[PDB]
Amino acid sequence: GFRKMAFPSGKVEGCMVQVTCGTTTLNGLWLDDVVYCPRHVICTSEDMLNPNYEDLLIRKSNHNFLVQAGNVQLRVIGHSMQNCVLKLKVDTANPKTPKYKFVRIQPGQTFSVLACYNGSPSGVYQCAMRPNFTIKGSFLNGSCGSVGFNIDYDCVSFCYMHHMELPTGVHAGTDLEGNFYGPFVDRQTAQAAGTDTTITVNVLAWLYAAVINGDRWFLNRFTTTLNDFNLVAMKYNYEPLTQDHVDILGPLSAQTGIAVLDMCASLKELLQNGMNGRTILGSALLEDEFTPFDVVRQCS
Amino acid sequence: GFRKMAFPSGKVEGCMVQVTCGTTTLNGLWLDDVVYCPRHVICTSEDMLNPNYEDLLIRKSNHNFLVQAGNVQLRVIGHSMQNCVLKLKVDTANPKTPKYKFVRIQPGQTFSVLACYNGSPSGVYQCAMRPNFTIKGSFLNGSCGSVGFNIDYDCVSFCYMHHMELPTGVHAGTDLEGNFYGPFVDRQTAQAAGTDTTITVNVLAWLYAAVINGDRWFLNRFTTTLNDFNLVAMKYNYEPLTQDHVDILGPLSAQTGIAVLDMCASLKELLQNGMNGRTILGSALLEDEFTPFDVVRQCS
Ligand SMILES: *C(=N)[C@H](C[C@@H]1CCNC1=O)NC(=O)[C@H](CC(C)C)NC(=O)c1ccc(-c2ccc(OC)cc2)cc1F
Ligand SMILES: *C(=N)[C@H](C[C@@H]1CCNC1=O)NC(=O)[C@H](CC(C)C)NC(=O)c1ccc(-c2ccc(OC)cc2)cc1F
C-alpha cells in the first residue's frame, strides 16, 4: 500500500511550550535556552488590523511574557524580535533539546506539522509547501506557533512556524528566522496568494509509486519531449518540468523501467482525458504532496 | 481546512524494541517487564506455509529470543504464547511505560499506526478498521509488530499489532491479546476477506465536516427515511445505518443545523449521480476514514 506518512513527532513534542502575553496565548518552540513564537502574541484584537510591532514591543518587558512548560514556568531573562518571530531568552535550557537545525525549504518540499493548542500536542500530519508559498493544513484558533519539521536520522529540521490563515482557507507562516514564506505579512488584511500550481515532479513520483504498488492502468505507450510536455503542463496550471526534475526522478525510473518522458506522456493523457472514474492508489485525483524522496523512503 | 491527523507518537516511540529469533527480526512492544511481538518471529521461511506454532515454540528457550532496546539488550527470563502473540518476560521494566490499556476496537473505528522497522520508528499515519476487519495501511517487510493506538489524554489505547498482508494488498493483524481481527490466520496461504463495505456513519461525519468548512455544494434539499436510505446503501456496498449511528451524528447535526436524514438524502444523490468532477474538501471520492469523534476533535 501507499499512505501519507508523517515523521515520528516524539522529538518535537518535548519542545512545545505555552507562551502568554496579555490575553493572547499561542505555542512556542523551546530549544536550548531560547523560546521561539510568532510575534503577534503581543497584539490585541484591536492592533491586529494594522499593528506597529515595534511600538507594540517597546511597551513590553521580560516579565510580561509568560512561558509554560507543562506545569513548570520558565523565567524570561531577555527578549528580541527577529523579522516576524519573537525570541524569548529563558534561564533554563530545554533538557530535551534534540539535535536540530533551522532550514528554509523550497516550494514542493514536504514536511510534518505538529498541530498544537496551548502548548500541548494535538496531532501530526504531512504537508507540502505549495508553489505559491502557502500550505493546505488544518489549523484552529490558538494553533499559531505550531511547527513544521523534517527528521533526518537523529537531527530535526525545523522549517515552518504557523502564523495566519488566508481568505481562501490555506495557511501562511515563516521559517524559524521569522522570514515569511511568500509575500505575506502578519496583519488582518485580505492578502492574496498567486494562482496555486501543481508540483509536477511530485505527481510523477506518485505515478511511479503507483507503478511499484501494482496500479498500472494509466500507463499508456506514447512518449513525449520535455518542451512538448511543458506546453501541456502550462495549460493545466502545472509547474514546468526541468532537466533537474528529470534527474531527480532517475532512481524511480530505473527501478520501474519506465523512462521519465514515458511517464510524462502518460500524465499528459491523464490531464486531457481525466480519470474516467478510475482511481490511482485509491485516489480519484492526482496527488502532488509526495516528493521523490518521500516515495523512495516509503517504498524502501 | 481538514486533514487526516494521527495522534502524537511520542509515548509510543519509547516502547518500540527489536525482537530477533533465529534469522527473523521484527518489532516488539515493551510495556512494563513484558515484550509483545507476533508469534511468527519463531518461523523460518519453510515453516511459514503451514506452521505448527506449538511444535515450533517447544524447541525454543528464553536465550533464543534476542530483544534490542536501541543499543541495550534486555534479558529474557520467561516466554509464553497467548493466541497469535508471543509474550517475552524481561528482567527490566520499561522506564518509559506510559499509562496504557489494551482494547479491541470495532469496525469503522480509527487509530494511528506507528510503522517501525528493526525496532525503530519510521513514520505515523491514521488508519481505520474496515468492516471486513482489514486495514489499508503501508507496510514493508519487517514491519510486523508495529502497533496501532489511540491517545486519550495521558492514556495510550493499544488496539492493533500488524501481522500479515493479504492478496488484495490490505493488511491483517491482532489485538494485543493475540486475537486476530476477522477470520484470518498467521500462515502463508491465500486468505480472502469479505467484500469491503463503506462505513456509512463515517462518510456522513465527513460530509458534516465539509459543511463546517464551507464546502456546501453537495447539499441538496430532499430528505429521506432510514429504511429508504438503507435500501440505496445496500446497492452501493454501504454499511447499513442504524438509529445508534443517527444519535452518534447528533452533535454534528446540531452544530450545522442539518438533520441527519437530510444529510442522508444528499449522500443518496451523490451515490447515484456521482461527483461530476466536483471535489469535497479537496477529494473527488467519499472518505470513510473519519469517525464522528475524529470530526468534532479536529473541528474543535
Ligand atoms: C493563530 N493563532 C491564528 C490561526 C488562524 C486562526 C484561524 N485559522 C488559522 O489558521 N492566526 C491569526 O489569528 C492571524 C493573526 C495575524 C495578526 C498574523 N490572522 C489570520 O489568521 C487571518 C488573517 C486574515 C484573515 C482574512 C480573511 C478574509 C478576508 O476577506 C476580507 C480578510 C482577512 C483571516 C484570518 F484568520
Ligand atoms: C511482517 N514482517 C510481514 C509484513 C508483510 C510483508 C509484506 N507486506 C506486509 O504487510 N508479514 C508476513 O510476512 C506474514 C507472515 C505470516 C506467517 C503471518 N505473511 C504475509 O504477509 C503474507 C501472507 C500471504 C500472502 C499471499 C498473497 C497472495 C497469495 O495468492 C496466492 C497467497 C498468499 C502474502 C503475504 F505477504
From Swiss-Prot, chains A, B:
Cleaves the C-terminus of replicase polyprotein at 11 sites. Recognizes substrates containing the core sequence [ILMVF]-Q-|-[SGACN]. Cleaves and inactivates human TRMT1, preventing tRNA guanine(26)-dimethylation of tRNAs. May cleave human NLRP1 in lung epithelial cells, thereby activating the NLRP1 inflammasome pathway. May cleave human GSDMD, triggering alternative GSDME-mediated epithelial cell death upon activation of the NLRP1 inflammasome, which may enhance the release interleukins 1B, 6, 16 and 18. Also able to bind an ADP-ribose-1''-phosphate (ADRP). 3CL-PRO exists as monomer and homodimer. Only the homodimer shows catalytic activity. Interacts with host FBXO22; this interaction promotes the proteasomal degradation of nsp5. Residues 1-300 form the Peptidase C30 domain. It comes from the Viruses. The gene is rep. The chain holds residues 3265 to 3564 of 7096 of the full protein. Inhibited by pyridone-containing alpha-ketoamides compounds 13a and 13b. In turn, alpha-ketoamide 13b (tert-butyl (1-((S)-1-(((S)-4-(benzylamino)-3,4-dioxo-1-((S)-2-oxopyrrolidin-3-yl)butan-2-yl)amino)-3-cyclopropyl-1-oxopropan-2-yl)-2-oxo-1,2-dihydropyridin-3-yl)carbamate) inhibits SARS-CoV-2 replication in human lung cells. Inhibited ex vivo by michael acceptor inhibitor N3. Inhibited ex vivo by compound 11a and 11b. The lineage of its organism: Viruses, Riboviria, Orthornavirae, Pisuviricota, Pisoniviricetes. It is found in: Host cytoplasm; Host Golgi apparatus; Host nucleus. The active site is at residues 40, 144. Changing residue 141 to A: Does not affect ability to cleave and inactivate human TRMT1. It catalyses: TSAVLQ-|-SGFRK-NH2 and SGVTFQ-|-GKFKK the two peptides corresponding to the two self-cleavage sites of the SARS 3C-like proteinase are the two most reactive peptide substrates. The enzyme exhibits a strong preference for substrates containing Gln at P1 position and Leu at P2 position. Residues 1-300 are cytoplasmic. This is 3C-like proteinase nsp5. There is a cross-link at residues 4, 89 (Glycyl lysine isopeptide (Lys-Gly) (interchain with G-Cter in ubiquitin)).
